[PDB]
Amino acid sequence: GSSGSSGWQGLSSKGDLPQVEITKAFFAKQADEVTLQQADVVLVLQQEDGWLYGERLRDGETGWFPEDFARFISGPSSG
């Protein structure tokens, strides 16, 4: 299959939310900040001029992550 598991299905709200790839690890210092790795994926949840909140698809950790440490894959389209 694709990795085992034993818990809840998930239960989360999301669709086409914005995603950014962490160019470099982002060691969380605060209690709101989440630790990210290089070339990671985080589902943005709340965009705050300065900090971008999301949930790491890795484990599902939801914290605050700066853009400087990520690259908007697709969101602010042009067309």
UniProtKB/Swiss-Prot annotation:
Described purpose of this protein according to its UniProt entry: Guanyl-nucleotide exchange factor of the RHOG GTPase stimulating the exchange of RHOG-associated GDP for GTP. May play a role in chemotactic cell migration by mediating the activation of RAC1 by EPHA2. May also activate CDC42 and mediate activation of CDC42 by the viral protein HPV16 E6.
Boundaries of every SH3 domain copy: 15-73
Subcellular location(s) of the protein: Cytoplasm
The protein's name in its UniProt record: Rho guanine nucleotide exchange factor 16
Domain remarks: The PDZ-binding motif mediates interaction with TAX1BP3.
Subunit field text: Interacts with ELMO2, EPHA2, RAC1 and RHOG; mediates activation of RAC1 by EPHA2. Interacts with TAX1BP3 (via PDZ domain). May interact with CDC42; stimulated by HPV16 E6.
Domain of life: Eukaryota
Full-sequence portion shown in this chain: 622 to 687 of 709
Protein induction: Up-regulated by HPV16 E6 (at protein level).
